[PDB]
């Protein structure tokens, strides 16, 4: 939902008080991403 | 008028009509980034 996948183009093109936003949404975005990674590497270490 | 603060800063100045409204967290303009400045994390309330 950011406007770009690149957080320095994000960060530029951007004033602060709004940058935090996008960059926050950014943040949730990948952070849920790794949660779901380790999860499922969790996961597939009690398979192994 | 349910809470204790730490301290309490009252700053005066005037402006034009306009900008009353500019005058917030981000919102650049000549005022903003040549002016008296809002911090874009604001903890207070502006009267006008």
């Known amino acids: 939902g950011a406007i770009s996948s690149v957080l320095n183009d994000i960060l530029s093109r951007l004033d602060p008080p709004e940058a935090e936003v996008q960059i926050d949404r950014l943040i949730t975005g990948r952070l849920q991403s790794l949660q779901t990674y380790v999860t499922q590497q969790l996961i597939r270490a009690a398979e192994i | ?48």
């Open chain 2, 1 to 48: 008028n349910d809470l204790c603060f730490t301290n309490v800063y009252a700053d005066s100045f005037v402006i034009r009509g306009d900008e009353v409204r500019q005058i917030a967290p981000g919102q650049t303009g000549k005022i903003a980034d040549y002016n008296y400045k809002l911090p874009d994390d604001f903890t207070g309330c502006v009267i006008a």
